[PDB]
Amino acid sequence: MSQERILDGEEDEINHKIFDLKRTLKDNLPLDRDFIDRLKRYFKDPSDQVLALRELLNEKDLTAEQVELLTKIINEIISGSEKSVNAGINSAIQAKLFGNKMKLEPQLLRACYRGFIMGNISTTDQYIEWLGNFGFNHRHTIVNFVEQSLIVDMDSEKPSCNAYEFGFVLSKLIAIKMIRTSDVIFMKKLESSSLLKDGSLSAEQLLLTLLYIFQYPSESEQILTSVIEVSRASHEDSVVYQTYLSSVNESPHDIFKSESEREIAINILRELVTSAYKKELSR
């Protein structure tokens, strides 16, 4: 129940730590001083620390009322860190589930969900972040992991957030799904345009390029410069611009700050298309 949600080390390695703390409590019956230092040394993560102490409370040898002298350690760790601790505990199983699927270290996922419900960066900055931390191939699965954890988090006896906060989280989640939606669309356009066949252009770099457009529509042209310096060797400008324009048109509207911001992006990309298609006549 508690040992399974510990994401620090191998199954035996974990067990080699719990019993020692049970040892310093049952047959030795010593005091609690450097005990905490050893606990923290064994487990660097507060969630894993609490889980270890909870397992200690599952032993048969109740030495009477030292339960309160042990639960004070549980509450001292939790107090003032209720959000982080609970976020780690509740999403542990999912971290192990998705970790095996994606071939990623579970505790990395715990940090992911932890940071998501505790941070306050924009929707686009989040997508970008997850991209850089977990890679191109995991970008759609990572959002699924966060969703699954949120569901479990909510159904937990001691959730990480309150009713109000979970609403905001969801709202952020939906914003992310919209980005994933445009991402999926953008990728389909790249395939049909045959911009990935050459092998010179990176779909990750192109994805980020689209993401920058969302944040700074006024600087669209400047942003696309990086792509042009590579696409010119094989493809024609109008083709790259069309991919971005048609993608933006078919993507959800609320990805942009506002209606006017979106039109700034569209008009600029519209002008870019015309200009390139014109220069293609003098060739």
Numbering used by the authors: 73 to 355
Q: What are the paper's exact sentences on this?
A:
The pathogenicity of Shigella sp. is dependent on a complex macromolecular machine, the type 3 secretion system (T3SS), that delivers into host cells a set of effector proteins required for invasion. Blockage of effector secretion before host cell contact is mediated, in part, by a protein that has been proposed to act as either a physical impediment to the entrance to the secretion apparatus, or as a gatekeeper that determines substrate hierarchy. Across bacterial species, this protein (known as MxiC in Shigella sp.) possesses only weak sequence homology and in some species exists as two separate polypeptide chains (e.g., in Yersinia sp. the homologue consists of YopN and TyeA). MxiC is an elongated rod-shaped molecule with a long axis of 86 Å.
In order to improve the quality of MxiC crystals, a shortened construct encompassing residues 74–355 (MxiCNΔ73) was expressed, purified and subjected to crystallization trials. Reductive methylation of MxiCNΔ73 yielded crystals that diffracted to higher resolution: 2.85 Å and 2.5 Å in space groups P212121 and P222, respectively. The first and last domains consist only of the X-bundle motif while the central domain also possesses a bent helix (α5) that is packed against domain 1. It is the first two domains of MxiC that are equivalent to YopN while the third domain of MxiC, equivalent to TyeA, is connected to domain 2 via a ten-residue linker. There are a total of seven independent MxiC molecules in the crystallographic asymmetric units of the three refined crystal forms. These structures reveal that, although the fold of each domain is maintained in all structures (rmsd over Cα atoms of domains 1, 2 and 3 are 0.5 Å, 0.9 Å and 0.8 Å, respectively), there is some flexibility at the interfaces between domains resulting in a “wobble” of the terminal domains about the central domain (rmsd over all Cα atoms of 1.4 Å). Interestingly, mapping of sequence conservation onto the structure across the more closely related Salmonella, Burkholderia and Shigella species reveals a hydrophobic patch on the surface of the central domain consisting of residues Leu222, Met226, Gly239, Leu242 and Leu245 (red circle). This region is buried by crystal contacts in all seven independent molecules of MxiC in the P212121, P222 and P43212 crystal forms, suggesting that this region may be a “hot spot” for protein–protein interactions. Surprisingly, the most striking difference instead involves the long á-helix (α9) in the central domain of MxiC, which is straight in all of our MxiC structures, but possesses a sharp kink in YopN when complexed with TyeA. As the sequence at the hinge is not conserved, and all MxiC molecules possess the straight helix conformation, these structures may represent genuine differences between species.
